[PDB]
Amino acid sequence: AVPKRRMSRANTRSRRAQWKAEAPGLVTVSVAGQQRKVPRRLLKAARLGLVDLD
Amino acid sequence: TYAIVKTGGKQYKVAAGDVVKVEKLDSEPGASVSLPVALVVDGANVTSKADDLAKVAVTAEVLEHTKGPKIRIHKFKNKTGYHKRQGHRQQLTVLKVTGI
Amino acid sequence: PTYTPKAGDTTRSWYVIDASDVVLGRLASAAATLLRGKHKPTFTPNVDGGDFVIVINADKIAVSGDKLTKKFAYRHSGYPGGLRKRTIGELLEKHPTRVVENAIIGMLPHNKLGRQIQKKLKVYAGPDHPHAAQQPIPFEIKQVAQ
Amino acid sequence: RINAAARANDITYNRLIQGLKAAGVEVDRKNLAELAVSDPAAFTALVDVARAALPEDVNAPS
Amino acid sequence: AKRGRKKRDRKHSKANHGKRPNA
RNA sequence: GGGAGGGGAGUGAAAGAGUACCUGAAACCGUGCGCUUACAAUCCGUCAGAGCCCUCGACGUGUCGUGGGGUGAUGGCGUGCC
RNA sequence: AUCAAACUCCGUGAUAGCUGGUUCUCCCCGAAAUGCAUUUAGGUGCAGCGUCGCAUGUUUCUUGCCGGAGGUAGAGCUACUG
RNA sequence: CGGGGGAUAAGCUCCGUGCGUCGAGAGGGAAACAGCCCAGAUCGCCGGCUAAGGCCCCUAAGCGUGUGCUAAGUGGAAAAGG
RNA sequence: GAUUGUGCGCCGAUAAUGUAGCGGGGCUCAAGCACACCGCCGAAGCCGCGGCAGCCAACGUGUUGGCUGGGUAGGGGAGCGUCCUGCAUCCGGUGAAGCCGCCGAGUGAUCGAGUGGUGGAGGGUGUGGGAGUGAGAAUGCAGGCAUGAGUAGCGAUUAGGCAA
RNA sequence: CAGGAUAACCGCUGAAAGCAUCUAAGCGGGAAACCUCUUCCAAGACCAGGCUUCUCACCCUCUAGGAGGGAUAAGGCCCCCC
Ligand SMILES: [Mg+2]
Ligand SMILES: [Mg+2]
Ligand SMILES: [Mg+2]
Ligand SMILES: [Mg+2]
Ligand SMILES: [Mg+2]
Ligand SMILES: [Mg+2]
Ligand SMILES: [Mg+2]
Ligand SMILES: [Mg+2]
Ligand SMILES: [Mg+2]
Ligand SMILES: [Mg+2]
Ligand SMILES: [Mg+2]
Ligand SMILES: [Mg+2]
Ligand SMILES: [Mg+2]
Ligand SMILES: [Mg+2]
Ligand SMILES: [Mg+2]
Ligand SMILES: [Mg+2]
Ligand SMILES: [Mg+2]
Ligand SMILES: [Mg+2]
Ligand SMILES: [Mg+2]
Ligand SMILES: [Mg+2]
Ligand SMILES: [Mg+2]
Ligand SMILES: [Mg+2]
Ligand SMILES: [Mg+2]
Ligand SMILES: [Mg+2]
Ligand SMILES: [Mg+2]
Ligand SMILES: [Mg+2]
Ligand SMILES: [Mg+2]
Ligand SMILES: [Mg+2]
Ligand SMILES: [Mg+2]
Ligand SMILES: [Mg+2]
Ligand SMILES: [Mg+2]
Ligand SMILES: [Mg+2]
Ligand SMILES: [Mg+2]
Ligand SMILES: [Mg+2]
Ligand SMILES: [Mg+2]
Ligand SMILES: [Mg+2]
Ligand SMILES: [Mg+2]
Ligand SMILES: [Mg+2]
Ligand SMILES: [Mg+2]
Ligand SMILES: [Mg+2]
Ligand SMILES: [Mg+2]
Ligand SMILES: [Mg+2]
Ligand SMILES: [Mg+2]
Ligand SMILES: [Mg+2]
Ligand SMILES: [Mg+2]
Ligand SMILES: [Mg+2]
Ligand SMILES: [Mg+2]
Ligand SMILES: [Mg+2]
Ligand SMILES: [Mg+2]
Ligand SMILES: [Mg+2]
Ligand SMILES: [Mg+2]
Ligand SMILES: [Mg+2]
Ligand SMILES: [Mg+2]
Ligand SMILES: [Mg+2]
Ligand SMILES: [Mg+2]
Ligand SMILES: [Mg+2]
Ligand SMILES: [Mg+2]
Ligand SMILES: [Mg+2]
Ligand SMILES: [Mg+2]
Ligand SMILES: [Mg+2]
Ligand SMILES: [Mg+2]
Ligand SMILES: [Mg+2]
Ligand SMILES: [Mg+2]
Ligand SMILES: [Mg+2]
Ligand SMILES: [Mg+2]
């Protein structure tokens, strides 16, 4: 089918707001003498140096 | 000590040394005008007899002439094509009571 | 201009009304008028000016006629064929206060002002009440001769 | 407001207005209301005046 | 039917003096 | 900084004139600031109407005044246009 | 890509008793859905009903009184037809 | 209101009425309801007096006064008959 | 005991979504019905005060007085705004034209030679003449932009994986 | 199953109305019909229920009226193997 009427601006914005993204957590890891932040999901990779860091 | 004054077919409660908005009455600014009386309250005594009320008098001083807020009028009916426009403003006078 | 109520000029009070051998209509009318505060000379429709009320001994309410079995209080849950009914006698037997609460609720405006107002009422069944620490003032229904 | 004040002062609004009319005092409902909210003593005095001015029997065929 | 009887009967209110549009 | 693109310093009256370059409105999308709303049945306005905030005077710490502005808790009324 | 008579330019702004739309303001006055006629009934001509002006201007309307003819309501039948 | 067509049916149709209203008419009254009752909007006023209808609360005004009826929620749906 | 006439009454009573045939709460300690009496609320009606307009009389070179002031189609009269022009004038790189505010003003279409920011090159008043001279709707047209929407799909019948 | 109050019906005591009558005062029996009794949901039931255990303490700022910000305990959450 099809919609009948143009919804209100307030309704549109209210429905739109919930659509977003969430930031992940960070952890401190020390490699080669300096501290840099990486997600906990990559702790072992960072420790063993298998992940490149810019 | 306060009394009641009749003016322009209506009444306003007023005490000594007060200012009220009253409908325009022919009088040169700066002069004094006498007004009738309606009721008098003094302490615990109340004067209500018509003869005493008539005998008592009110004196006040006219300050200036002022015009009220503007108001816009429209007439409208549905499915007629009738549209009417009309503006209007009212004239007011500001006075200060002197003694009663 | 006409007088209007300020932020903190309002004052409330505590009232108690007995319900021993009294007619429900009169009791409800008195309660409604007291809740609304029509008696107080500081009435203004937009802001409540009501006064607290206490009702005691609801079970002794007297009702005339055969209403004990010919008057029915209805309500419906919402699903199809869910309209079930109860009689005033059973209502008094089970929940003494429900009848008076419903009567007073119906005796008041149904807007949200009245919705907030109905908070002002407390109704009890026994002859006692734990609200004795606030010194309620006894009240009596009277007629002004004219 | 006037009805509430009169009922508090133990007299009906209709009889109060009848007494005012009989006494021939022409003050207006706004004045009575403002006075009642402001001067209960004055309101009581006016009510007493009206009651005194009331006729003997309100039920008489006159 | 029931619908018809109502409006004609409701016309007998003393407010309208008994005469109303559409019976 | 890969570029695209941008910041200083200069050109010039202006760079609110930077080849997408006069004057730059409305639909449209914004960031910051002030007020209000999570027990509510509204052709979404009006008449009343507390609180809060901004302001103009006189008087002092805030209180009135022939004072203005924005917000509006709450009551009455209310069946779009051709 | 369309056929109970293809497509393009012109006659050509083909023609409709038919459906649709026609915008800035105020002051004064203020209608009908009736009769007659019509290859006529959802069309249209005339009359009545409105407005502006010109001319005679109470000739308009209500009440009282007076002079007037009707054949209904009712009622009646050896007064006629049943 | 007085009539015809109709099954003495329709919110049906066709007539006549110095007849009312709506149509081209806001307010108040009957919950809502153009055609019913009162009442004809030049504009402003935080003034008085009233028609129709109302005066337990919703909702402004009398749980008015005096004399009588009601046992049926008749009040707040209708006939032959008992 | 019966027939007589009267005011109230009872039975006769039964359709489909949820009491639903007093508006609700509720009312026979009538707030139900009949007859008298006294009062009150109740509009844009009338009265009171004031502003404007039309017709008419009086006297006057506009004061007073008497009536009226709703309208669809329709008739008559009187007006605002925009452009180009004849004539006579004034403003302007010491800032002219539009745009966005504040403050005000006329009974209307609106006005401000009163003030603030942007801009840079022509404008206003008075009295005549001529208008392509005034938008909301015709399933109107040219250009730009809203929702469904960050939803469906990403166009087969084989299928990729690994080291560099 | 069992219990409570009922419709149709069956009754006991009884004047109005010396008798009689299940009635106008009262008292009783009487069904898959109604209320508890079976299973499940349920304190957003705004009267927002009830009984228990755990911590019940560290700062800064605006200006001391409250509020805001930072650091903690009880607990909870994120990520991980299922
Ligand atoms: Mg009929
Ligand atoms: Mg330069
Ligand atoms: Mg461009
Ligand atoms: Mg540009
Ligand atoms: Mg809230
Ligand atoms: Mg509602
Ligand atoms: Mg409304
Ligand atoms: Mg409504
Ligand atoms: Mg052919
Ligand atoms: Mg071809
Ligand atoms: Mg030709
Ligand atoms: Mg051609
Ligand atoms: Mg053609
Ligand atoms: Mg043609
Ligand atoms: Mg059409
Ligand atoms: Mg006319
Ligand atoms: Mg004809
Ligand atoms: Mg004559
Ligand atoms: Mg004759
Ligand atoms: Mg006959
Ligand atoms: Mg014969
Ligand atoms: Mg007839
Ligand atoms: Mg007939
Ligand atoms: Mg017809
Ligand atoms: Mg006809
Ligand atoms: Mg009319
Ligand atoms: Mg009307
Ligand atoms: Mg109405
Ligand atoms: Mg008028
Ligand atoms: Mg009156
Ligand atoms: Mg009357
Ligand atoms: Mg009242
Ligand atoms: Mg009564
Ligand atoms: Mg009697
Ligand atoms: Mg009935
Ligand atoms: Mg009958
Ligand atoms: Mg019979
Ligand atoms: Mg009889
Ligand atoms: Mg019955
Ligand atoms: Mg009712
Ligand atoms: Mg009038
Ligand atoms: Mg005139
Ligand atoms: Mg007019
Ligand atoms: Mg027209
Ligand atoms: Mg016209
Ligand atoms: Mg111009
Ligand atoms: Mg030009
Ligand atoms: Mg020059
Ligand atoms: Mg310049
Ligand atoms: Mg400049
Ligand atoms: Mg410039
Ligand atoms: Mg000229
Ligand atoms: Mg011209
Ligand atoms: Mg010409
Ligand atoms: Mg043109
Ligand atoms: Mg347009
Ligand atoms: Mg388009
Ligand atoms: Mg879309
Ligand atoms: Mg999808
Ligand atoms: Mg998909
Ligand atoms: Mg493909
Ligand atoms: Mg017996
Ligand atoms: Mg017996
Ligand atoms: Mg809770
Ligand atoms: Mg934890």
TrEMBL record, chain C:
Pfam families for this protein: Ribosomal_L13
GO biological process, one term: translation
Keywords: Ribonucleoprotein, Ribosomal protein
GO CC annotations, alphabetized: cytosolic large ribosomal subunit
GO molecular-function term, one example from the UniProt record: structural constituent of ribosome
Ribosomal protein keyword on record: yes
Recorded superkingdom: Bacteria
Function text: This protein is one of the early assembly proteins of the 50S ribosomal subunit, although it is not seen to bind rRNA by itself. It is important during the early stages of 50S assembly.
Family: Belongs to the universal ribosomal protein uL13 family.
Subunit (UniProt): Part of the 50S ribosomal subunit.
Protein name in UniProt: Large ribosomal subunit protein uL13
Annotated source species: Mycolicibacterium smegmatis
UniProtKB/TrEMBL annotation, chain E:
Annotated stretches, region: Disordered: 1-23
Domain of life assignment: Bacteria
NCBIfam families: ribo_Myco_bL37 (NF047428)
Protein name in UniProt: Uncharacterized protein
Organism: Mycolicibacterium smegmatis (strain ATCC 700084 / mc(2)155) (Mycobacterium smegmatis)
